[PDB]
Amino acid sequence: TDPIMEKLNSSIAYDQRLSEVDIQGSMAYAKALEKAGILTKTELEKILSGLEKISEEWSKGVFVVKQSDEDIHTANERRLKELIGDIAGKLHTGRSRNDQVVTDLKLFMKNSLSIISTHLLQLIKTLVERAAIEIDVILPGYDHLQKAQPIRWSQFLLSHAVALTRDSERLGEVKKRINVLPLGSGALAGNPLDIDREMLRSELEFASISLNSMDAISERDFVVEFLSFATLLMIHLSKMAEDLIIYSTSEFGFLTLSDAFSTGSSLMPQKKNPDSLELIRSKAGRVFGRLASILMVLKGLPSTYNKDLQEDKEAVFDVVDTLTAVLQVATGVISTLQISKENMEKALTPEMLATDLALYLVRKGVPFRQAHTASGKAVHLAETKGITINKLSLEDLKSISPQFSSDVSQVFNFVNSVEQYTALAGTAKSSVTTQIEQLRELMKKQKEQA
Amino acid sequence: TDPIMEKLNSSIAYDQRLSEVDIQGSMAYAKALEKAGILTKTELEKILSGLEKISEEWSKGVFVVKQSDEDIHTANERRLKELIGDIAGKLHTGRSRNDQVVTDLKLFMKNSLSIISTHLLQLIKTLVERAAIEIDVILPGYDHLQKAQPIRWSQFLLSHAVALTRDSERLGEVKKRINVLPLGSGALAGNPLDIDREMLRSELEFASISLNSMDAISERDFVVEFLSFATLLMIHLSKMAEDLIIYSTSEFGFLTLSDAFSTGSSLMPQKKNPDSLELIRSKAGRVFGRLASILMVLKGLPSTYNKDLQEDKEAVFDVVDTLTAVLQVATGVISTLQISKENMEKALTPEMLATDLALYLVRKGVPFRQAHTASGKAVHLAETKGITINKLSLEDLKSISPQFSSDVSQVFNFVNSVEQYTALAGTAKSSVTTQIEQLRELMKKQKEQ
Amino acid sequence: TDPIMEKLNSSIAYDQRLSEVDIQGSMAYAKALEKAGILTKTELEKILSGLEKISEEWSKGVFVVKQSDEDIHTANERRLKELIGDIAGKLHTGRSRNDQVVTDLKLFMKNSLSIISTHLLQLIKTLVERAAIEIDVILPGYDHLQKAQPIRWSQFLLSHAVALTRDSERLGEVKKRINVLPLGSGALAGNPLDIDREMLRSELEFASISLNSMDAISERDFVVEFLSFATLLMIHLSKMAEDLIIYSTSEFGFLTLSDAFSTGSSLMPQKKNPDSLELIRSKAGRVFGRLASILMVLKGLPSTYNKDLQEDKEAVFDVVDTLTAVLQVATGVISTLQISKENMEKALTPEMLATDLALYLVRKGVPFRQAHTASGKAVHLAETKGITINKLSLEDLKSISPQFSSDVSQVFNFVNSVEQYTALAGTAKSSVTTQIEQLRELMKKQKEQ
Amino acid sequence: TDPIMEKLNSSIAYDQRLSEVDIQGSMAYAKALEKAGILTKTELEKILSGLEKISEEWSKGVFVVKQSDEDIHTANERRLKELIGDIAGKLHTGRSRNDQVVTDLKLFMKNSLSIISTHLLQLIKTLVERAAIEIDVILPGYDHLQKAQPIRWSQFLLSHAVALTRDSERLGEVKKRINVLPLGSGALAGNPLDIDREMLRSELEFASISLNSMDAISERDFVVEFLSFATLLMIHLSKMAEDLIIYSTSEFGFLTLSDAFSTGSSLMPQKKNPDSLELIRSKAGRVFGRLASILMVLKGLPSTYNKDLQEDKEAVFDVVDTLTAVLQVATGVISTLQISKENMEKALTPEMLATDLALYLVRKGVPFRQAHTASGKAVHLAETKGITINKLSLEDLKSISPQFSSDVSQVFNFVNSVEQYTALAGTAKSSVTTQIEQLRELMKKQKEQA
């Protein structure tokens, strides 16, 4: 009754996208009511005909929302009544807004996750395929954002792809629990008409049916874990965005975003602002905010239904839209960015091979400590000689350790450096090739699970 | 190094519980080094022997931590050197603190999750078996905390068991990803000595090995999702606590917690403070806090390793200890509480049967709207006569709808009320029985897993 | 430019409520540009005239947003040019979207906080008025949701008013830092035309001007602060909602919400669902979520301007609208609810006076512990006799302690019970009256801010 | 009586730091009980003398905790009864753990905030002093982490100091509400003995007394807003840390941390890892987590006292210790870091002066739009000629606009560039000098206030 309460309760402004799933839920329910003998066959066919008409109206974008419609459910109900009359009312028999709305949200989320999966797998495939093509590129691997050791650019790309693949796996786990029918739980204690929930499951294409009515009505686990999945995915995208923003600075100069995913001024044509990456990074907080809100909404609520649960819709809709846009923007950025092999290569310095120099002695039998001490001495000798370690003479090296032989010159090669990492998961070309094949197979498995 | 800086790096105060998994990881690495020819059989034997001694020291609780030890890892390395000499130093060949620590954490969590799983399944089993025993008990079902319709007490217990079974399922998913060997990732680019990672996997009993060195070293997905699993589980426990706290008020009077999980005064002997439930509820905030911290810690960090990741340990340890204690208290609470079948039944009122009266008409073929209106008129008529609806005469009912027959008297029975819900998942006895069977089967599956 | 990125960069969809403040900001800047010699007097006249017309177009609701407008700033800029031509373009001289946007958001928030303040103060005033008028009502005070000791219903109402008054004080602190002018900070290094920022401050009515251009452009402390204030305020309202929902249950039976703030069913006319309170309680999570998002957005960002900052608008707009609605609903609920003085009074029991019986002995000299033991004995004695302690005879009491005299009968009076609490802040009537006077004095000052 | 419960209820492992404020609270209450006649003037003597003893024991490190002490309160009480016997029991008269604990926590927080204030103001002071010393240093100002325009290094340092002064201002606001006496609220309905709360206030040195007993017992606003203050402060430090980490990369090369606040290897002696900054950044999440936990703990709790509130202690202690250490480390970092004026200056490029080139026309009366267009055309002409804008000949410039005169040469000077920003708050030297003055005044006033 209160005008402000009334405004707070209205959701027609944001839930119209539930139009089709809402109709589908009603068609399925109508068929079950008919089996239960609540509707005659002629009544069922009139209702289905009407519902199908409404579906088409939304599909064609001709549906007319009216001022009285406070939500999508009321709008669809008004339209069906207009089309078929009083018979429409029988559809509420044994059904509650409590199980009808949660059914709508799950069907909607199932469909959204299917779309998110497509965009996520496309992002992963884009990283994997670019890694395959640019597998010969080498640049600095960073630790504490300080140059540490040479790595293949592809090992970097794949590190992001692997993390995203775990997000895809979580997406599949979340979808599995979402794909469980809640309809037929009634208001709280179950459907009172011995409704055939297996028929509802089959009609709505859910994988199984809810185990307990009170739980099905009041739980929002599916909302929470979708938000947890989305937040972790965003954390990964924020790390990738941070990496690309830094690598795109003029200071690092490793890559340049395309005009399509950056902003700039005619005054400074070469200055490309990574708008795309900053947008992506920022959405991690926007999504995390939604996760935080729902956990707080649910914390400490008693059984069974409480109006507090209505906050679920806006959080889900926002995150679905955000991920859909963000994943596609990320695919665009990765597929269209331009790397500078020249600058990546020039960043490789002899100082980054001192560890390899110690490793060289290790493979000759020199103990860890002594191998490192000797390498350190080579570094110091080079310094006092005013040169770099790759330029010390063999005689220079032997003055530090007789274990240094002429083959030590092979240490001072950046390809030889990355090729030491043949153990699985490493940056050697063979290891990177293996990861690309492993990821291609994971994507295939996940693609079919979806 | 700055003294304040040094205090901030020190983790020895809380990471000593990684002592055993740290030794285990080193034994497996030493064996791999021998296979790679970095260690001789003799060196390997001497290293393993010293590691066995350190393990025994921690076990006997005699390990001596020294003021110079910054962390559990340094303590063990120092002790190994003290025990066997500088050959101990060869153990670090090709291994970084970066892949060594993440290995220890995953080993620790795998073990901790096995423990949490046992306690979680015991809580669910407790709920399910009590639901079976008290299946005949009926009480009010609440909607917006207002009495709505009769339901079986067992339907309520099982609503919680079902939610907890989903938490168990997520626990299994999280465990599978934690059960992946990260050791042999080196500092960032992988292990430089072509170390046998399959051998490491086998010795440490991981199910598979990490796919990428940079990811394996820098990701803390496993911590995040463990914290997400833990938070959602705590949300469920906070809800059950809220329910039980309200049902235990003297106003509701449905149940009383045992003395072991409540507190009170000799001045008001019949009053019991739901101590245990309030503690359980508050832990939702505590665990959520850890989830929030690690997500913020990870946000915006660049590749590959950054010192920020050290915040993981304290968050993991706190949540592991919190869930372990909370799950056991919850089981104790559910197991030992006493219900008042008397008060639960006395709370059932005729007014809570008006919906059933409309449903009676629906079954006779009266359209939804008309049935609702007819029941409403019955409720209003009874109000005008100063009686309850179960007291209206058949004649009074017929004046409202000729569809009311003599069998309408069956509507005013609370057992008949709950027995309407035979559709799967409902509160009818047969449906509750099916739920118990399904949950017993589920627990069996999850325990085998 | 990628179409999806274009849409994501588009703010026009939600930033239109900044229309008027955007214009006010431009009017002030134009005036300063003329003083700086960038605009002539006639140009200034035409520009101010055009700006006023755009302002009227927005207020009349006839403003035409075009597909090319990516944000409100672009919209007003395009419109001004359509109205007055080429000279419109001189208005942006030395200005950046960076200082234009923070100026707009701060002006919007200043106005919004004045509105929120009005509603917050009305809520407190509504609670205080109710506490004054229902000052004789006594009901149980709760400890762990268990009946503890009698308290005045007014003390309960005032506990909520006191907390909300602290929220009002924080509101004032946030408003002061928001009331600082950022305009004239340029894109990063400051305004390049020696613009008169004091004139800008005076025209826009800000209290002072920002100290550093880089900070002014990149900080969103004012957003975070507002969000922390809003979140703590919602926590307070979530607690009040929890209380009223519990008290409104038929089990407690203390109060009933009006039809305007609850939902009902003709099938159960006595049952009222407190959906207004459930709504309020749920908004705490919604508001908290905005606070968590902005904190995460800002965490780890480098200097100076970053596109990430654009997430501020939607979070502020949502919390502003949420607070404005919830506060008014809360006021209505408190103002229109109906208490049952009968049920609140019936809820007071003799058992709740056992602590008073002990205090009675304490005032006569018996030490803490001994008085406690004595009372416990009286409770137990009453139990063995199957009676309430107020029914015990004086000899029954003397057998326990000789300090029990005939006047111990005064202990068994609920009004006498609450009247023991005369120490400042207690539930005695004199203390409650003092509280009412203190809160009114506080509000007077706060409104005078 | 459950064992796990007892373990969860224990806090002796972490609340001993409340030993002294606990004793001060008991001394204050003892005195009031006397004035109220609960204690004889000689019972007050035995009690006080005994408390002052326990005070000495704790301050000597000789206090002995027993396996029976579950918390600091019980420890101090057990000990009081060991020193003076049974009489110590009268101290509980009319007082509750509910009001005793909040009192201890507020007294503890008041003292901790004075310490935090000292470290915070010292950090601000170090930034401002450094800004005054290095006022002549110029480097790039960044927009989207891309070089935008010249700015003074001091403008960057002061931007951080200004944000920190707002944190200092919030600290003071939080302290004021913490400086309110809760003792004498009893368990819920207030103190039942007409205790003199003004005396309690005066003894404990609180500024005023709590207004309502139920609120004073159950509110934890002071904890929440201390945590909000701490979190925003950490956000500021997380930003300064991010900046310094990036500027310390070899790629940027603008500064180097001292050995005391970084870590390094003998193998790469020139590589310094910014451990201190990474540690500082990581604590934003740790502190935010405490804020998040307490907000969730409080949400939905009914009046009045609930055990849930006990989570306050650990959250406050953690954040107090975290802030105390972090602020001191930041002060050390800023104070001892080494800048490379050469590299900061070398980072300034002519392309960063295109905006200045347009402003040059603006000051000659050319409208904003045409000035920007002309500059854009100058930039393009230079680009096609393969030269920088400062190398375009005056003839080239005039081909773009006759308004370009020989004095346009003054535009291509980075000092002239920063000196344009004389409007208050800008980067011109006079403006930076004014900021330093204002911040000195602000620090003086905040220190004076508290």
DSSP readout, D285-301?
HHHHHHHHHHHHHHTTP
Residues forming a β-bridge with A146: A143
Contact C224, C298 (CB under 8 A): yes
> Torsions phi, psi of D252, nearest 5?
-80, -50
Contact D239, C301 (CB under 8 A): yes
From residue D164, alpha-carbon distances to C219, D167, D312 in Å are 11, 5, 26
Residue of B38, B165, B136 whose CA lies nearest to B91 = B38
Task: Let me know if C208 is a catalytic residue.
Answer: no
CA pair distance D282, C299, nearest whole angstrom: 10
Residues forming a β-bridge with B256: B338
Contact A17, A68 (CB under 8 A): no
What contacts D39, CB < 8 A, 6 or more positions away?
D30, D33, D47, D90
Residue B449 DSSP symbol:
-
Burial class (CB in 10 A: 0-12, 13-18, 19+), A177: middle
CA pair distance C328, C446, nearest whole angstrom: 19
Please count the other Cβ atoms lying within 10 Å of the Cβ belonging to residue A386: 7
Q: Do A368 and B89 touch (CB under 8 A)?
A: yes
Exposure string of D91-126, with b = 16+ CB inside 10 Å and e = fewer, is bbbbbbebbbbbbbbbbbbbebbeebbebbbebbbb
Residues of B in contact with A424 (CB under 8 A): 184, 190, 197-198, 209
CA pair distance B160, C121, nearest whole angstrom: 42
CA pair distance D278, A145, nearest whole angstrom: 10
CA pair distance C139, C350, nearest whole angstrom: 13
D180: left (phi over 0), alpha (psi -120 to 50) or beta: beta
Amino acid identity, position C442: L
> Torsions phi, psi of D142, nearest 5?
-105, 140
CA pair distance B203, A205, nearest whole angstrom: 45
From residue B115, alpha-carbon distances to B109, B119, B326, C89 in Å are 10, 7, 13, 70
Residues of B in contact with A433 (CB under 8 A): none
What contacts D105, CB < 8 A, 6 or more positions away?
D18, D223, D312, D313, D316
How many angstroms away from the CA of A85 is the closest CA of chain C?
24
Residues forming a β-bridge with A180: A208
Give the pair of three-digit tokens for residue C221: 């402390």
CA pair distance C113, C121, nearest whole angstrom: 12
CA pair distance D426, D432, nearest whole angstrom: 7
Give the pair of three-digit tokens for residue A417: 């450096």
Residues forming a β-bridge with D141: D149
CA pair distance C22, A209, nearest whole angstrom: 54
Please count the other Cβ atoms lying within 10 Å of the Cβ belonging to residue A101: 24
Please count the other Cβ atoms lying within 10 Å of the Cβ belonging to residue C325: 18
Cα D308-D313-D314 angle, rounded to 5 deg: 100
What contacts B274, CB < 8 A, 6 or more positions away?
B241, B244, B245, B248, B257, B261, B262, C144, C145, C146
* DSSP annotation string for B31-86: HHHHHTTSS-HHHHHHHHHHHHHHHHHHHTT-----TT--SHHHHHHHHHHHHH-G
What contacts A209, CB < 8 A, 6 or more positions away?
A180, A181, A184, A197, A198, A200, A201, B424, B425
C-alpha of D69 from chain center: 35
Q: From the candidates A144, A250, A266, A406, give the one annotated as an active-site residue.
A: A144
Cα B193-A436-A326 angle, rounded to 5 deg: 120
CA pair distance B171, A173, nearest whole angstrom: 12
CA pair distance C393, A102, nearest whole angstrom: 61
Residue A188 DSSP symbol:
T
CA pair distance D139, A38, nearest whole angstrom: 79
Instruction: Give yes or no for B144 touching C (CB within 8 A).
Output: yes
Contact B112, B178 (CB under 8 A): no
The domains found in chain D, sorted by start residue, are 11-107+179-218 (1.10.275.10), 108-178+219-348+421-447 (1.20.200.10), 349-420 (1.10.40.30)
Give the pair of three-digit tokens for residue B124: 């669910």
Shortest CB distance from D288 goes to which of B7, B279, B296? Answer: B296
CB pairs under 8 A between A and D: 98
Classified as helix, coil or strand, B139 is strand
Name the one residue in this structure whose structure tokens are 């992963």. Answer: A124
* DSSP annotation string for D63-114: ----TT--SHHHHHHHHHHHHHGGGGGGGGTT--HHHHHHHHHHHHHHHHHH
* DSSP annotation string for D355-367: HHHHHHHHTTT--
Classified as helix, coil or strand, D7 is helix
Please count the other Cβ atoms lying within 10 Å of the Cβ belonging to residue B397: 25
CA pair distance C337, C272, nearest whole angstrom: 12
Please count the other Cβ atoms lying within 10 Å of the Cβ belonging to residue C210: 26
Chain D interface test: which of B6, B283, B296, B337 (most D C-beta within 10 Å): B296
Task: Let me know if D265 is a catalytic residue.
Answer: yes
Q: Do C355 and B267 touch (CB under 8 A)?
A: yes
Residues forming a β-bridge with C143: C146, D305
Please count the other Cβ atoms lying within 10 Å of the Cβ belonging to residue D342: 10
What contacts C155, CB < 8 A, 6 or more positions away?
C141, C426, C427, C432, D189, D212, D213, D214
Residues of D in contact with B279 (CB under 8 A): 5, 8-9, 307-308
What contacts C372, CB < 8 A, 6 or more positions away?
B266, B267, C358
Q: What determination technique applies here?
A: X-ray
CA pair distance D157, C215, nearest whole angstrom: 10
Give the pair of three-digit tokens for residue A63: 């549906």
Q: From the candidates C265, C282, C303, C409, give the one annotated as an active-site residue.
A: C265
Residues forming a β-bridge with A142: A147
Q: What share of chain B is helix, strand, coil (3-state, %, to 5)?
A: 70, 5, 25
Residues of D in contact with A274 (CB under 8 A): 144-146
Amino acid identity, position B75: A
Amino acid identity, position D227: L
| Dihedral sign, Cα of residue C255, residue C257, residue C259, residue C265 | negative
Helix ranges restricted to H, D87-196: 97-133, 153-178
CA pair distance B294, B307, nearest whole angstrom: 13
CA pair distance D38, B441, nearest whole angstrom: 65
| Size of chain B, expressed as the number of residues it contains | 449
How many angstroms away from the CA of B92 is the closest CA of chain D?
16
CA pair distance D150, D354, nearest whole angstrom: 11
CA pair distance A428, B190, nearest whole angstrom: 9
Rounded to whole angstroms, the maximal C-alpha distance in chain C is: 102
Amino acid identity, position C20: E
Contact A69, B350 (CB under 8 A): no
Query: B97-133 vs B19-35: helix axis angle to the nearest 10?
Result: 130
Contact B277, B237 (CB under 8 A): no
Q: Do C358 and B267 touch (CB under 8 A)?
A: yes
> Torsions phi, psi of B64, nearest 5?
-105, 110
Contact B319, B230 (CB under 8 A): yes
Contact D385, D397 (CB under 8 A): no
CA pair distance C66, C54, nearest whole angstrom: 14
C-alpha of A398 from chain center: 54
> Torsions phi, psi of C159, nearest 5?
-60, -40
From residue D3, alpha-carbon distances to B261, B335, D70, D73 in Å are 10, 16, 12, 20
* DSSP annotation string for D339-407: E-HHHHHHT--GGGGHHHHHHHHHTTT--HHHHHHHHHHHHHHHHHHTS-GGGS-HHHHHHH-TT--GG
Give the pair of three-digit tokens for residue D110: 């008041």
Give the pair of three-digit tokens for residue D147: 């070089």
Instruction: Give yes or no for C194 touching D (CB within 8 A).
Output: yes
Instruction: Give yes or no for B24 touching A (CB within 8 A).
Output: no
Of the CA atoms within 13 Å of residue B108, those in its CB half-sphere come to: 26
CA pair distance B400, B361, nearest whole angstrom: 11
Cα B198-B204-B208 angle, rounded to 5 deg: 45
CA pair distance B278, A300, nearest whole angstrom: 10
Shortest CB distance from D251 goes to which of A144, A252, A292? Answer: A252
| Size of chain C, expressed as the number of residues it contains | 449
Instruction: Give yes or no for D1 touching B (CB within 8 A).
Output: yes
Shortest CB distance from C261 goes to which of A5, A242, A299? Answer: A5
Give the pair of three-digit tokens for residue A129: 């395929």
Residue of D114, D109, D107 whose CA lies nearest to D21 = D107
C-alpha of A251 from chain center: 30
Query: B221-247 vs A153-178: helix axis angle to the nearest 10?
Result: 20
